Amino acid sequence: PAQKWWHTGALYRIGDLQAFQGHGAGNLAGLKGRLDYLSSLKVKGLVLGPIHKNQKDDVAQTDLLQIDPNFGSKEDFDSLLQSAKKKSIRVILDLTPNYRGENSWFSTQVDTVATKVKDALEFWLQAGVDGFQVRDIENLKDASSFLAEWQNITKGFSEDRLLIAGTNSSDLQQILSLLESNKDLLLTSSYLSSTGEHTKSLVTQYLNATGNRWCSWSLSQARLLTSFLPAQLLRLYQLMLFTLPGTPVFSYGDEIGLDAAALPGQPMEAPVMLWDESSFPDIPGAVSANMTVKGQSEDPGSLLSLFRRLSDQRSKERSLLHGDFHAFSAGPGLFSYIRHWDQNERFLVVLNFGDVGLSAGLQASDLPASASLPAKADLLLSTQPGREEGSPLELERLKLEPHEGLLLRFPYA
Amino acid sequence: PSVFLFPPKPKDTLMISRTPEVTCVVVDVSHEDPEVKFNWYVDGVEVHNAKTKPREEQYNSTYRVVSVLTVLHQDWLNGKEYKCKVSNKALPAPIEKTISKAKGQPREPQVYTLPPSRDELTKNQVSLTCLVKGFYPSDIAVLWNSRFVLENNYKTTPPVLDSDGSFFLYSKLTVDKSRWQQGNIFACNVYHEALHNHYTFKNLALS
Numbered sequence: 001p002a003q004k005w006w007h008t009g010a011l012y013r014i015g016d017l018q019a020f021q022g023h024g025a026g027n028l029a030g031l032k033g034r035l036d037y038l039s040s041l042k043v044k045g046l047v048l049g050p051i052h053k054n055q056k057d058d059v060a061q062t063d064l065l066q067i068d069p070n071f072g073s074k075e076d077f078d079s080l081l082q083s084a085k086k087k088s089i090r091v092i093l094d095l096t097p098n099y100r101g102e103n104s105w106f107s108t109q110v111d112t113v114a115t116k117v118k119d120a121l122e123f124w125l126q127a128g129v130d131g132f133q134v135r136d137i138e139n140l141k142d143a144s145s146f147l148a149e150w151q152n153i154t155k156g157f158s159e160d161r162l163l164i165a166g167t168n169s170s171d172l173q174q175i176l177s178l179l180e181s182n183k184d185l186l187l188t189s190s191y192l193s194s195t196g197e198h199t200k201s202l203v204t205q206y207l208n209a210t211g212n213r214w215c216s217w218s219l220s221q222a223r224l225l226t227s228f229l230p231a232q233l234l235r236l237y238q239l240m241l242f243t244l245p246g247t248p249v250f251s252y253g254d255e256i257g258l259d260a261a262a263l264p265g266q267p268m269e270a271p272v273m274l275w276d277e278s279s280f281p282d283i284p285g286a287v288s289a290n291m292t293v294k295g296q297s298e299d300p301g302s303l304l305s306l307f308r309r310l311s312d313q314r315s316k317e318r319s320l321l322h323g324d325f326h327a328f329s330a331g332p333g334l335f336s337y338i339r340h341w342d343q344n345e346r347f348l349v350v351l352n353f354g355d356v357g358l359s360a361g362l363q364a365s366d367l368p369a370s371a372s373l374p375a376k377a378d379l380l381l382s383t384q385p386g387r388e389e390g391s392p393l394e395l396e397r398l399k400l401e402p403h404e405g406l407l408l409r410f411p412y413a
Numbered sequence: 414p415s416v417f418l419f420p421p422k423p424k425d426t427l428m429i430s431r432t433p434e435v436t437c438v439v440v441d442v443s444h445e446d447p448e449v450k451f452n453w454y455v456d457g458v459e460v461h462n463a464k465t466k467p468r469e470e471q472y473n474s475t476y477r478v479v480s481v482l483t484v485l486h487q488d489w490l491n492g493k494e495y496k497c498k499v500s501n502k503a504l505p506a507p508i509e510k511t512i513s514k515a516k517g518q519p520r521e522p523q524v525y526t527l528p529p530s531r532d533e534l535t536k537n538q539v540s541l542t543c544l545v546k547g548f549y550p551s552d553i554a555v556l557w558n559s560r561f562v563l564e565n566n567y568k569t570t571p572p573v574l575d576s577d578g579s580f581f582l583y584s585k586l587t588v589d590k591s592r593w594q595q596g597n598i599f600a601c602n603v604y605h606e607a608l609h610n611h612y613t614f615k616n617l618a619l620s
């Protein structure tokens with residue numbers, strides 16, 4: 001199963017150009033100016049838009065082949081891809097049709113709409129697009145079928161073109177039924193939206209039922225992590241998403257812990273991106289410096305620093321790119337696993353989900369002895385500060401603080 | 414000669430980015446005896462950091478003299494007492510005035526945003542309403558915003574005393590109907606000592 005560009009790193013959903021880039025500047029030309037920042041996150045693909053002409057609930061004033069001119073010209077898009085390709089950043093285009101409406105898939109026009117997609121797929125693939133996203137698929141009749149059509153069209157143009165399907169479904173069987181027909185299809189879901197053994201179960205059960213095939217890992221198809229997670233679990237969940245076998249998918253602001261509910265006047269799905277203290281309206285008490293990109297850039301302890309380091313690991317280390325995944329038992333609320341490819345550096349992930357400090361209580365015998373644990377492994381990082389990064393920890397004596405995650409590394413041996 | 418002592422502004426005590434002041438104002442100061450001495454006491458302890466301003470003749474041929482004492486946020490909120498003593502020749506005795514935060518169990522504001530009445534959709538501009546109630550003491554501030562900017566086209570009523578001894582007010586933000594009818598989000602932002610972090614907000618938007 002050959003390596004593709006979306007296996008090599010995180011995907012980054014930018015669903016609202018103006019929120020992301022700032023007031024008035026929600027243009028494709030302005031996204032160009034942010035590619036360096038994104039490159040600084042080591043993201044491998046932007047999921048963009050939609051940017052197509054959509055008049056709420058007007059199947060006829062919906063041309064997926066024409067950019068809404070508020071975002072800019074087709075030239076700006078051509079120029080964006082060019083600049084994006086040049087920085088090794090791939091571009092996925094969201095083509096969810098009625099994105100201005102409430103049912104993205106319109107109503108009573110199931111075949112009429114699909115056609116515009118089919119035509120859009122071709123048009124945009126010719127324009128130089130690296131893949132497509134379509135959300136809210138549970139509000140699409142003949143879901144399983146329509147996705148297979150678009151898959152085969154996308155894969156037909158090139159095996160190096162991705163189609164992402166998004167759903168609000170958190171039910172395993174419904175997700176498997178969509179994936180039964182198309183198994184090379186990236187499916188973002190609410191599957192992972194608690195218990196350390198339960199997140200363990202969810203992950204292991206999913207991989208179990210999909211024969212350890214490639215998948216996405218996310219919390220949702222669109223929403224920030226903060227929609228599902230309290231602040232104290234963000235760092236842990238980032239460590240996990242960046243170290244689980246598959247493509248981690250985030251939305252803009254996840255790297256700074258952007259929480260729409262904590263910010264006045266912000267829609268859940270598109271809060272203003274906090275570049276600096278001038279980004280948000282002057283509402284005192286709403287945004288401190290340590291909630292912004294600028295502030296968190298200056299702080300090695302920041303969630304953005306952690307994001308950057310994890311994205312770096314995930315995009316350069318073979319064991320994380322395409323390593324095996326072996327979970328094993330630990331203390332009640334611990335989720336522990338190793339990633340191992342061939343004879344490359346191994347990684348041990350130990351995640352403390354509970355809010356009590358715990359002994360890891362790792363048991364190395366349930367693991368296959370292809371990569372059983374050394375006595376001591378170098379701590380790459382902890383989610384919490386004050387540990388001794390770059391120096392060994394004794395694996396049998398691991399004590400994790402509440403909500404602490406650890407990333408250990410050890411060579412083949 | 415008469416004295417009026419004024420508390421700091423709510424925004425100044427609640428938002429720690431700003432500098433609260435107590436203000437001692439002396440009026441009916443004669444041309445014959447215009448010299449005024451101010452003494453300041455915080456909980457009976459004399460302080461010397463006050464800034465007295467140059468006396469200013471009013472149209473009624475009297476002088477108004479003002480002394481300003483900077484206060485610490487927490488001192489005001491913790492109920493410390495600020496005393497201004499005014500001495501002047503025309504006075505039989507110095508005039509002493511004392512001010513502090515209202516005493517009484519602080520009560521957390523409830524914040525309820527209310528959309529325009531349907532009947533207002535006749536008009537070009539609509540009224541977005543923020544009811545704040547159940548708060549004590551009366552010191553409070555209210556600000557509006559939309560997704561990207563402050564919204565300044567608003568007016569806020571003074572606090573009104575409610576039946577239960579708490580206070581309420583309403584803030585009214587006027588916006589173009591189209592902005593409302595297009596589903597844009599607005600937020601009413603409230604500052605009060607009895608909120609967590611002295612701050613909360615509630616959004617308002619069409620369904």
Ligand SMILES: *[C@@H]1O[C@H](CO[C@@H]2O[C@@H](C)[C@@H](O)[C@@H](O)[C@@H]2O)[C@@H](O[C@@H]2O[C@H](CO)[C@@H](O[C@@H]3O[C@H](CO[C@H]4O[C@H](CO)[C@@H](O)[C@H](O)[C@@H]4O[C@@H]4O[C@H](CO)[C@@H](O[C@@H]5O[C@H](CO)[C@H](O)[C@H](O)[C@H]5O)[C@H](O)[C@H]4NC(C)=O)[C@@H](O)[C@H](O[C@H]4O[C@H](CO)[C@@H](O)[C@H](O)[C@@H]4O)[C@@H]3O)[C@H](O)[C@H]2NC(C)=O)[C@H](O)[C@H]1NC(C)=O
Pocket residue numbers: 417419420421422425433434435436438440441471472473475477
């Ligand atoms: C000669 O003239 C002077 C000056 O008066 C002005 O000029 C004359 C010529 C006329 O045009 C007047 O109409 C003008 O006002 C006369 O002085 C007046 O004496 C009055 C008493 O007889 C006195 O009344 C008392 O007012 C209190 C409230 O005063 C507030 O509000 C009024 C408006 O309502 C305003 O004019 C005052 O300046 C004062 O404003 C507040 O000032 C403080 C301090 O600056 C502000 O707080 C500070 O603000 C800064 C930022 O600016 C910063 O944030 C600080 O942190 C903060 O502390 C505050 O924001 C201002 N408020 C407002 C709304 O702007 C009442 O409380 C008081 O009531 C009590 O007594 C009454 C009886 O007298 C009772 O009925 C009542 O129940 C209460 O018990 C009084 O009504 C006037 O304030 C005073 N005027 C001025 C300008 O000082 C003088 O009398 C006259 N001589 C004669 C002819 O006898």
